[PDB]
Amino acid sequence: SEKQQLSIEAARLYYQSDYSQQQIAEQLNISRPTVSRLLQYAKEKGYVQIRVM
Amino acid sequence: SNAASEKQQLSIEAARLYYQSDYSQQQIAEQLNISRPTVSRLLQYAKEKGYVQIRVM
DNA sequence: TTGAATTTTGTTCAA
DNA sequence: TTGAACAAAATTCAA
């Protein structure tokens, strides 16, 4: 749940505020590989939803 | 729009393969017989037009 | 988790 | 507008 709020924070920064993973790494004081892994986790828990026509 | 309709269709097919089928941009290029850079551009075109929609929470 | 290695993506250039 | 080439962004691996 600490993990959860963080994946959400990473996701908003990435998809709503157009940040790169590195920008998000610095802004949250964590590694780029951790950003990658959270971004996958956000999509897994459906915090990030992708729908196609 | 008939050249546009071609682009829309090609765009939507690229997006499905990418986001539903988990294909690499390279794989999509093979299947649709187009350059990988063209795929990169089509995927962006699909997001711009709302063919793909990404929502957080 | 992260530092290193590897693979995938986006962009510039010339056409 | 498209594909070639390459720098760099993202992902995977090993620890």
Which nt is closest to the CA of B35, judged by C1'?
A: D3
The structure was resolved to a resolution in Å of 2.3
8 Å CB contact between A21 and A35? yes
- The phi and psi torsions of A9 (rounded to 5 degrees) equal -60, -45
Instruction: Quote the minimal CA–CA distance from A47 to chain B in Å.
Output: 5
Method: X-ray
**How far apart, in whole angstroms, are the C-alpha atoms of residue A53 and residue B15?**
8
H-helix segments, B1-57 = 3-19, 25-32, 36-49
Tell me the two tokens of residue A7.
Answer: 């994946």
List, in order of start, the domains of chain A with CATH numbers.
Answer: 1-45 (1.10.10.60)
Q: Fill in the amino acid letter for B43.
A: L
- Residues 6 or more apart whose CB falls under 8 angstroms from that of B17 comprise B23, B27, B28, B31, B32
Q: Which residues of B24-40 are buried (b: 16+ CB within 10 A; e: fewer)?
A: ebeebbeeeeeeeeebe
